[PDB]
Amino acid sequence: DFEEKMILIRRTARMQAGGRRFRFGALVVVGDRQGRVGLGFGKAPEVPLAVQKAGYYARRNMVEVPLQNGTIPHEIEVEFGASKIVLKPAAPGTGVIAGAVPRAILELAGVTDILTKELGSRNPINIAYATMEALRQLRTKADVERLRKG
Amino acid sequence: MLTDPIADMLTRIRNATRVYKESTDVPASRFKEEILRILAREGFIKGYERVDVDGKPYLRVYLKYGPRRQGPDPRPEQVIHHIRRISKPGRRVYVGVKEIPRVRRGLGIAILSTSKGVLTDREARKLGVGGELICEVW
Amino acid sequence: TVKELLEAGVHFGHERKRWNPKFARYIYAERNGIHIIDLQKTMEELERTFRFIEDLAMRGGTILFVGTKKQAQDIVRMEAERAGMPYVNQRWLGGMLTNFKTISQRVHRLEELEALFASPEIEERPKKEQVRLKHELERLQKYLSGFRLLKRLPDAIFVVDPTKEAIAVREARKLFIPVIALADTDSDPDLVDYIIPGNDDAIRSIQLILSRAVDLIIQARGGVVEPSPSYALVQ
Amino acid sequence: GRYIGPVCRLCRREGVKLYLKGERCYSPKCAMERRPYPPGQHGQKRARRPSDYAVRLREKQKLRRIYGISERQFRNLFEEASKKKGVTGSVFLGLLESRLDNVVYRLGFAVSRRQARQLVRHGHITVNGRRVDLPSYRVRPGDEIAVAEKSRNLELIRQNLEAMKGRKVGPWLSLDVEGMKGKFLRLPDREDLALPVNEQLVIEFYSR
RNA sequence: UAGCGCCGGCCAACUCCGUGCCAGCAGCCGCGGUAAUACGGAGGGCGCGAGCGUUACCCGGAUUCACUGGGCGUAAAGGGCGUGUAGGCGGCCUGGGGCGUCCCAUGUGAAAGACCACGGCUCAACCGUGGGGGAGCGUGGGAUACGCUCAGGCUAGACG
RNA sequence: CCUGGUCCACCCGUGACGCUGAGGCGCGAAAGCGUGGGGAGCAAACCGGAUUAGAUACCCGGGUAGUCCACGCCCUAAACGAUGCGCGCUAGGUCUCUGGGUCUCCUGGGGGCCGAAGCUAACGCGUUAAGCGCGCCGCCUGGGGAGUACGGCCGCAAGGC
Numbered sequence A: 001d002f003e004e005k006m007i008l009i010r011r012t013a014r015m016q017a018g019g020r021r022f023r024f025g026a027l028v029v030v031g032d033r034q035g036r037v038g039l040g041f042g043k044a045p046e047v048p049l050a051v052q053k054a055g056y057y058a059r060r061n062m063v064e065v066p067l068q069n070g071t072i073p074h075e076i077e078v079e080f081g082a083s084k085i086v087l088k089p090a091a092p093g094t095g096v097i098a099g100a101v102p103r104a105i106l107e108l109a110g111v112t113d114i115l116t117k118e119l120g121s122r123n124p125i126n127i128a129y130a131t132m133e134a135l136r137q138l139r140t141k142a143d144v145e146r147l148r149k150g
Numbered sequence B: 001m002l003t004d005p006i007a008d009m010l011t012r013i014r015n016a017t018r019v020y021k022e023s024t025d026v027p028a029s030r031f032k033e034e035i036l037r038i039l040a041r042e043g044f045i046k047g048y049e050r051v052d053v054d055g056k057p058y059l060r061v062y063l064k065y066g067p068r069r070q071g072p073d074p075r076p077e078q079v080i081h082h083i084r085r086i087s088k089p090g091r092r093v094y095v096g097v098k099e100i101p102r103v104r105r106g107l108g109i110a111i112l113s114t115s116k117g118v119l120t121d122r123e124a125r126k127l128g129v130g131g132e133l134i135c136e137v138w
Numbered sequence C: 001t002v003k004e005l006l007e008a009g010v011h012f013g014h015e016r017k018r019w020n021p022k023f024a025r026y027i028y029a030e031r032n033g034i035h036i037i038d039l040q041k042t043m044e045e046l047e048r049t050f051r052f053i054e055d056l057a058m059r060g061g062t063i064l065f066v067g068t069k070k071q072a073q074d075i076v077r078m079e080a081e082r083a084g085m086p087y088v089n090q091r092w093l094g095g096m097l098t099n100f101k102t103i104s105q106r107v108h109r110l111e112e113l114e115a116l117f118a119s120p121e122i123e124e125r126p127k128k129e130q131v132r133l134k135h136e137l138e139r140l141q142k143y144l145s146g147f148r149l150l151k152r153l154p155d156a157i158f159v160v161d162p163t164k165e166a167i168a169v170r171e172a173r174k175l176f177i178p179v180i181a182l183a184d185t186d187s188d189p190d191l192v193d194y195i196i197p198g199n200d201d202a203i204r205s206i207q208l209i210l211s212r213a214v215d216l217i218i219q220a221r222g223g224v225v226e227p228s229p230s231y232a233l234v235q
Numbered sequence D: 001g002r003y004i005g006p007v008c009r010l011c012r013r014e015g016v017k018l019y020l021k022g023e024r025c026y027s028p029k030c031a032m033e034r035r036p037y038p039p040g041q042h043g044q045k046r047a048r049r050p051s052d053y054a055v056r057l058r059e060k061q062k063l064r065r066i067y068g069i070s071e072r073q074f075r076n077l078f079e080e081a082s083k084k085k086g087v088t089g090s091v092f093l094g095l096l097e098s099r100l101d102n103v104v105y106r107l108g109f110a111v112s113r114r115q116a117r118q119l120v121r122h123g124h125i126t127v128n129g130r131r132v133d134l135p136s137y138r139v140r141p142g143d144e145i146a147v148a149e150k151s152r153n154l155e156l157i158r159q160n161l162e163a164m165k166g167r168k169v170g171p172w173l174s175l176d177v178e179g180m181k182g183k184f185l186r187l188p189d190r191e192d193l194a195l196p197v198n199e200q201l202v203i204e205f206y207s208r
Numbered sequence E: 001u002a003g004c005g006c007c008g009g010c011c012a013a014c015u016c017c018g019u020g021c022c023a024g025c026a027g028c029c030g031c032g033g034u035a036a037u038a039c040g041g042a043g044g045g046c047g048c049g050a051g052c053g054u055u056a057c058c059c060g061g062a063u064u065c066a067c068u069g070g071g072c073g074u075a076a077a078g079g080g081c082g083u084g085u086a087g088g089c090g091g092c093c094u095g096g097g098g099c100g101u102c103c104c105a106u107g108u109g110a111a112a113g114a115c116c117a118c119g120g121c122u123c124a125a126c127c128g129u130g131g132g133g134g135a136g137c138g139u140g141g142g143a144u145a146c147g148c149u150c151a152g153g154c155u156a157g158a159c160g
Numbered sequence F: 001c002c003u004g005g006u007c008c009a010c011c012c013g014u015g016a017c018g019c020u021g022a023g024g025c026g027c028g029a030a031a032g033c034g035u036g037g038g039g040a041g042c043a044a045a046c047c048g049g050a051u052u053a054g055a056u057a058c059c060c061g062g063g064u065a066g067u068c069c070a071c072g073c074c075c076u077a078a079a080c081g082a083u084g085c086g087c088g089c090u091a092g093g094u095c096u097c098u099g100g101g102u103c104u105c106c107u108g109g110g111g112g113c114c115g116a117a118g119c120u121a122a123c124g125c126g127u128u129a130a131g132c133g134c135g136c137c138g139c140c141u142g143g144g145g146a147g148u149a150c151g152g153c154c155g156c157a158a159g160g161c
């Protein structure tokens, strides 16, 4: 039902008297490839617990993606922090052209063909967030004319 | 004074909408009026009307928003997400008819000033004329 | 289901300062350095509000009555005891909604210890336990008193001062739980889904509004209970 | 080039059963049957989760080694198909399936693709009646791929075509067994091919 | 005839022995001071294959000279401050001209090359035929919303 | 005494006469230079006393240039809000300086604080923007070498650009 892939696992460190203390962050994307995605960052003393927890969070926070023939309805730039994502729609057969992070996110949203670019900070976390935000901002002609009825 | 009256109007509208103002006045000009017409027709504003603030003419732009939302931040969706000035004083943007852009693959508009008058991208492309590219709205 | 000119004390708001500009639409004018609530708009919102309330009530939904204001304490404690509704009286514990599972564990320990003081086992084990667990029950009954009635997340919450209770408000928003409130001039109208624009200070306004509300509830589920006995709490 | 080495070892590295050997890859000797783990000293040890790049690389290598084509020819074909109209993946596969060696194999004149390549290079194959010794020769729809009249008495072709009696040939191919000739009817759809390959991963591999 | 490079991460491919901050490696981060997947050899593996590597140079990634597409409180970056020249820029209404801008027609834009199709060498490379393009500039005609200019008017900027 | 800037009320007058501003020109703390004067207190240099392992310092007693005036140079700075100028727009609350008004209050100009939206890498900014916009000038492009070398211009020199 729900396919999930982790983006980056990382190990961080705080400092306590007489040592470093390690924690583990995990970025997990979940999606059905039907147009529903989700993204979460779990943090735990050990890697598996962090991954599992990240999955839990990612299933908590979801995004409904309005797919048109496997691609996006229209282009978006999105700035999250210093990170910037540029998503642009593409003709079928193109395939997903993106970095690791937005590739995973898009692919799990069920995107077949798309064109992207990462600008500014490449920091995977903020890029992921940027991507989710982009997807969260997409509209359909339907939604548009839903807004402009008046 | 105002260096760019039109850019100023667009900005007035932006600033007004982000706080969800009911309406906003902008100093009146026939050009501004012509733009506002397109805005109303395309459905970005409830409408505009000429008023008088003090002894001077103004245009009340009645703004338009989405329905109240759920979760945190109930603040409704903007009907105007993005309104941005293209041709400015000091750099002016003119496009041919083949050079006329397509905003958000059709989900937006672009306002051109042509010899056949102030038009949208669809309108001018259909009329077959290019012009000065005033702004993009989506 | 009457109100109208029978509202006495409500139109009085907070002072000139301390207010929220977002509340400007619900103000009539400023008298003697006091924002006075608009007479008509109050009933205007009252209709839609109480309509929502009646719907929710006859559907079988639960409402969480909330306030700490100490003006509203002794009122809420009974008014919510009427009908079936759960209440928060003493203070709002962060996570009662979002952390609700974990908070419910405390209720389980509450009826756990009530069960302990039921059986013969009170005397079993040294007085060290008997002095402790008694205080545990003490505080558990002090805080979670009205909260014990919640077997699952509420279908709406009722709030007396939405600025004071703004945490409850906040995570009610967060959980998509409909937010009913009695708003004064110091409060943000946008956060409140169904607003009751009146004085949250005087015991009179609180009494009037909450009594009428519970009256509407029991009216919706039938049985027509007698007029609320909070009227003696005018003091 | 075109390899010339141990083949069923690749059956093992790609983790999927490939038929580069014709028969015996069907017989339970394939060693992909009895040693499904990768070749070498470390083959039986637990594999670490492969990089995205690893997956793409290995998928493209799978696709390439199936047809036994050099990376150069392969790359050229892919870029050619990329410049072309239509979906790049399907057109790629179509172009691969248009190779004379592959067609000879598909029609069952040869049990394996490599054997087919030998059959082409040695002039046992004709196209529209004219001899063609290039395995890379692109077949077009309407072309009749036959066996050399002088080669029809060869023992191997006897064996191969006697086996082909009763066997069905792919929808885009027709086969006349008695005359030892066959027709290439059209270019195969993605739907036609049974390939254990995600082409989009290969597109993604050159996408890098 | 089968060779060449690589197997610490970036980056596909790991074990034994020798060496002991030595000998050496290294594009960047780095490896080596007794049990080195990083030196040297061996087995094994990965990648290309009549080639494979290295050096140099060009564009790329580099939105790192940012027109598209960047910045300047503390990261590099506001001139010590004013006065003002040239220049850049310009509030509302009407009219004329049509310089900018826009549109139609036409000339030009050689061939080769680039793109598409068909065809000749058994294929391809190579080549032939045909088709489709095209910014720019010249000429003729037209439009006047915006910018320009000339003529008139207003008082919301500015000055008194 | 001479003289600059500025704010408010009146809605009187002119009718876009505006903004910015490469060069140019003027101003420009302290120190420093030239000429003349002045010189109480302080005080680089310097002369001693202490301290210290030493003490070319910190502490103590003296002391010259200088600090002060006039005139003429020098053009630097953590010359700082480390934030170019001008105009329009976008919640409020509070303290304060200074006008005007029907003087609880309203309205205008300036200086502070907390804060809506928003912005920011964060810190923080937030009608005195670091927000939303337009115009124009100046400037940036990894660290050291180096604000050096060379050339030019300026300066009596120190030295500056």
Ligand SMILES: NC[C@@H]1O[C@H](O[C@H]2[C@@H](O)[C@H](O[C@@H]3[C@@H](O)[C@H](N)C[C@H](N)[C@H]3O[C@H]3O[C@H](CO)[C@@H](O)[C@H](O)[C@H]3N)O[C@@H]2CO)[C@H](N)[C@@H](O)[C@@H]1O
Residues within 6 Å of the ligand: D079, D080, D083, E127, E128
């Ligand atoms: N210079 C030869 C010319 O070729 C023309 O034809 C041109 C194109 O049709 C042809 O394209 C070929 C072809 O197989 C098919 N149409 C598609 C294929 N991807 C290309 O194959 C090749 O093209 C060129 C070299 O030819 C290179 O990029 C590369 O070797 C390869 N992509 O390549 C030719 C350019 O060399 C015309 N016949 C004529 O102008 C003339 O003979």
Ligand SMILES: NC[C@@H]1O[C@H](O[C@H]2[C@@H](O)[C@H](O[C@@H]3[C@@H](O)[C@H](N)C[C@H](N)[C@H]3O[C@H]3O[C@H](CO)[C@@H](O)[C@H](O)[C@H]3N)O[C@@H]2CO)[C@H](N)[C@@H](O)[C@@H]1O
Residues within 6 Å of the ligand: E072, F084
């Ligand atoms: N920090 C630069 C400042 O720029 C100011 O003006 C600058 C901005 O006001 C103006 O807007 C620019 C826009 O032109 C350009 N195309 C893109 C740029 N991101 C914008 O910047 C603006 O918008 C963004 C949000 O989008 C804000 O985060 C930012 O604070 C704001 N300056 O562009 C100008 C050139 O940078 C002052 N003139 C200057 O004194 C000051 O140093």
Ligand SMILES: [K+]
Residues within 6 Å of the ligand: A079
């Ligand atoms: K932003």
Ligand SMILES: [K+]
Residues within 6 Å of the ligand: A061, A129, A132
């Ligand atoms: K998110």
Ligand SMILES: [K+]
Residues within 6 Å of the ligand: E022, E023
């Ligand atoms: K040695």
Ligand SMILES: [K+]
Residues within 6 Å of the ligand: none
């Ligand atoms: K070691």
Ligand SMILES: [K+]
Residues within 6 Å of the ligand: none
């Ligand atoms: K080695």
Ligand SMILES: [K+]
Residues within 6 Å of the ligand: none
């Ligand atoms: K480069």
Ligand SMILES: [K+]
Residues within 6 Å of the ligand: none
């Ligand atoms: K200077």
Ligand SMILES: [K+]
Residues within 6 Å of the ligand: none
């Ligand atoms: K001297």
Ligand SMILES: [K+]
Residues within 6 Å of the ligand: none
């Ligand atoms: K400076």
Ligand SMILES: [K+]
Residues within 6 Å of the ligand: F103
């Ligand atoms: K007064």
Ligand SMILES: [K+]
Residues within 6 Å of the ligand: none
């Ligand atoms: K913040």
Ligand SMILES: [K+]
Residues within 6 Å of the ligand: none
């Ligand atoms: K601080």
Ligand SMILES: [K+]
Residues within 6 Å of the ligand: none
């Ligand atoms: K501070």
Ligand SMILES: [Mg+2]
Residues within 6 Å of the ligand: A064, A065, A066, A138
């Ligand atoms: Mg949607």
